[PDB]
């Protein structure tokens, strides 16, 4: 019941009983909370409640100290002090932003903006509060019960009346009943069991609601600039492959933490692995939020770093298949490749945290909590996609509010910028350089003359809220008959449902823009599907078109984004 003040750091016995996290508030700060909000329950060693039998007064503002006990106006003795007086709430050892964080429902962009412009203590309060609110909202959704099992990949579902149904995409992971984790896709519905189980009729599925542990470590440890490379030992012999990164590698060693903005195909992976060859004795932990991002780092390491000095950390509650070619779960290997949520408590010379636009302030804290490191390197691109904010429905989250790293990259700039895209035909590089990179991204490849745009609004149907554009898929089908080179194309759209329809009609493999991020394909077909904030989002548009190595077809709904594609237009 005794701790330090979320705002002041001041010792107190006061916690807010109304805040979902129950934060330590100092006497000056507890007042400014309770006097400005619906938050009136204060706690010290016991509740600030009226001690008179039967009395229901809990509001600290209506309470007095009578000796050692607390009483309302109705029950206080003649010799009593009000608990709230002279800007303070009585307790042992005797803010606008804290109040908005404590009380908001996290449905508004402005809530995320504040969780990222605030002081560092308040970022942790925000990130733990938000995460708590995110988890207790899962409980709101209906249970799914198996009506009839059709096949090994399809069934019919019965949905609890009175509660809403959760979106049926890969984003929403269910637990079966403990028959392992399942996903569903769109009365026939497509099921995918982590454990391949003979799905029983009357079995039920629920969204995993995991307890939110407290945060302790900052999002970013305090910045430290050094005059000399600190705690690392450079090679004199560095392979010519990594020659271009040597100055950035020296920056990494002359600061506590460094940021790298690397637009698509600028060599982020190459930078991350090349850091281990430049500091060849350094113990390096490679981390990202997703298994995919960690596995991409493993693929690069396999090529360039000694396999026997590499461990892939795999949580015993194994969900998706991942990287098999390293020793699994050897924490003390020089090179450790591990998702944020599986990190062990350990030390490192260098922590490399990849795909930083996908990280939350919660993840940033967890990393600083589990890893004691001489140097922290934050790699990604704030012009790419953030973690979905499931509670956010009003306003758009700008990249400067994605997390602490992205705020730094969008305000004071990144420490390091990889400026040459080696993946994408120049048509794409030039479009996205003007769009999100203030013309600082350069094309290494020539124009491919395999980059086409068609402005075709089509007709928008919806499976629930998920968009479908059959006519845009019809145009693609027409195009594929005349463009056989594209038979190998990956079909990409901002909507799972459009992808499910494109899958049946075209037979192309299929990706949402959000699942496409980090991957590349020779040929890409993009159907915008709809003009929504989702489909017109420049970060998502950026990721969509930078997947392509050789060609892209964009069937567009949005005049602005259509006109900005530096592509050959088609017609039909
Ligand atoms: C994250 N929590 C606080 C924030 C202040 C900085 C130190 C951690 C303790 S809380 C108030 O959410 O439990
Ligand atoms: Zn305080
Ligand atoms: Zn409160
Ligand atoms: Zn009373």
From Swiss-Prot:
Effect in UniProt of substituting residue 399 to S: In strain: Mu/B.1.621
Residues the record lists as binding Zn(2+) 13: 50, 55, 72, 75
Chain residues that bind Zn(2+) 11: 5, 8, 26, 29
Effect of residue 321 to D: In strain: Gamma/P.1
Ranges occupied by LRR repeats: 208-228
Binding site for Zn(2+) 12: 16, 19, 33, 39
Residues annotated as binding a ribonucleoside 5'-triphosphate: 262-269
Effect of substituting residue 372 to C: In strain: Omicron/BA.2, Omicron/BA.2.12.1, Omicron/BA.2.75, Omicron/BA.4, Omicron/BA.5, Omicron/BQ.1.1, Omicron/XBB.1.5, Omicron/EG.5.1
Reported effect, residue 348 to V: In strain: Theta/P.3
Residues covered by the CV ZBD domain: 1-105
Effect noted on mutating residue 213 to I: In strain: Omicron/BQ.1.1
Domain (+)RNA virus helicase ATP-binding, first and last residues per copy: 237-418
Catalytic activity: ATP + H2O = ADP + phosphate + H(+)
(+)RNA virus helicase C-terminal domain boundaries: 419-572
Signal sequence interval, chain numbering: none
Quaternary structure note: Interacts with nsp8 to form the replication-transcription complex (RTC): nsp12, nsp7, two subunits of nsp8, and up to two subunits of nsp13. Interacts with host TBK1; this interaction inhibits TBK1 phosphorylation and decreases by 75% IRF3 phosphorylation, which leads to reduced IFN-beta production.
Purpose: Plays a role in viral RNA synthesis. Multi-functional protein with a zinc-binding domain in N-terminus displaying RNA and DNA duplex-unwinding activities with 5' to 3' polarity. Activity of helicase is dependent on magnesium. Binds to host TBK1 and inhibits TBK1 phosphorylation; the interaction with TBK1 decreases IRF3 phosphorylation, which leads to reduced IFN-beta production.
Entry protein name: Helicase nsp13
Organism expressing this protein natively: Severe acute respiratory syndrome coronavirus 2 (2019-nCoV)
Gene, per the UniProt record: rep
């Amino acid at each position: 019941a005794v701790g330090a003040c979320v705002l002041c750091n001041s010792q107190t016995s006061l916690r807010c009983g109304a805040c979902i996290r129950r934060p330590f508030l100092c006497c000056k700060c507890c007042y400014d909370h309770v006097i400005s909000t619906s938050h009136k329950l204060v706690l010290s060693v016991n509740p600030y409640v009226c001690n008179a039998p039967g009395c229901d007064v809990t509001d600290v503002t209506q309470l007095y100290l009578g000796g050692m006990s607390y009483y309302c106006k109705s029950h206080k003795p003649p010799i009593s002090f009000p608990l709230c007086a002279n800007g303070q709430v009585f307790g042992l050892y005797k803010v606008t932003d804290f109040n908005a964080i404590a009380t908001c429902d996290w449905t508004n962009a402005g809530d995320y903006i504040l969780a990222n412009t605030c002081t560092e203590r308040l970022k942790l309060f925000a990130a733990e509060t938000l995460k708590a609110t995110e988890e207790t909202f899962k409980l709101s959704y209906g249970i799914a019960t198996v009506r009839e099992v059709l096949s090994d990949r399809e069934l019919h579902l019965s949905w609890e009346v009175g509660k809403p149904r959760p979106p049926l995409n890969r984003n929403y992971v269910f637990t079966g009943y403990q028959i392992g984790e399942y996903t569903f896709e769109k009365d026939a519905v497509v099921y995918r069991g982590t454990t391949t189980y003979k799905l029983n009729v009357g079995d039920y599925f629920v969204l995993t609601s995991h307890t939110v542990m407290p945060l302790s470590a900052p999002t970013l440890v305090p910045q430290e600039h050094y005059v000399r490379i600190t705690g690392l030992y450079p090679t004199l012999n560095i392979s010519d492959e990594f020659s271009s990164n040597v100055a950035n590698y020296q920056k990494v060693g002359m600061q506590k933490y460094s940021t790298l903005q690397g637009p698509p195909g600028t060599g982020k992976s190459h930078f991350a692995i090349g850091l281990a060859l430049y500091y060849p004795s350094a113990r390096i932990v490679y981390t990202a939020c997703s298994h995919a991002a960690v596995d991409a780092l493993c693929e690069k390491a396999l090529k360039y770093l000694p396999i026997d000095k590499c461990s892939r950390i795999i949580p015993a509650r194994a969900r998706v298949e991942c990287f098999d070619k390293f020793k699994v779960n050897s924490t003390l290997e020089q090179y450790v490749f591990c998702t944020v949520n599986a990190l062990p408590e350990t030390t490192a010379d260098i922590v490399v945290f990849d795909e930083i636009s996908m990280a939350t302030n919660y993840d940033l804290s967890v990393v600083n909590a589990r890893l004691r490191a001489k140097h922290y390197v934050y790699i990604g691109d704030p012009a790419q996609l953030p973690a979905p904010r499931t509670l956010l429905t009003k306003g758009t989250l700008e990249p400067e509010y994605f997390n602490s790293v992205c705020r730094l990259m969008k305000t004071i700039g990144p420490d390091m910028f990889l400026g040459t895209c080696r993946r994408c035909p120049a048509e794409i590089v030039d479009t996205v350089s003007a769009l999100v990179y203030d013309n600082k991204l350069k094309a290494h490849k020539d124009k491919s003359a395999q980059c086409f745009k068609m402005f075709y609004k089509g007709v928008i149907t919806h499976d629930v809220s998920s968009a479908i554009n059959r006519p845009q898929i019809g145009v693609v089908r027409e195009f594929l008959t005349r463009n056989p080179a594209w038979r190998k194309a990956v079909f990409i759209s901002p909507y799972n449902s459009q992808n499910a329809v494109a899958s049946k009609i075209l037979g192309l493999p299929t990706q949402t823009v959000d699942s496409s991020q980090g991957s590349e394909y020779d040929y890409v077909i993009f159907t915008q599907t709809t003009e929504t904030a989702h489909s017109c989002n420049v970060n998502r548009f950026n990721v969509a078109i930078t997947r392509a190595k050789v060609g892209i077809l964009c069937i567009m709904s949005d005049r602005d984004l259509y006109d900005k594609l530096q592509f050959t237009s088609l017609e039909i």
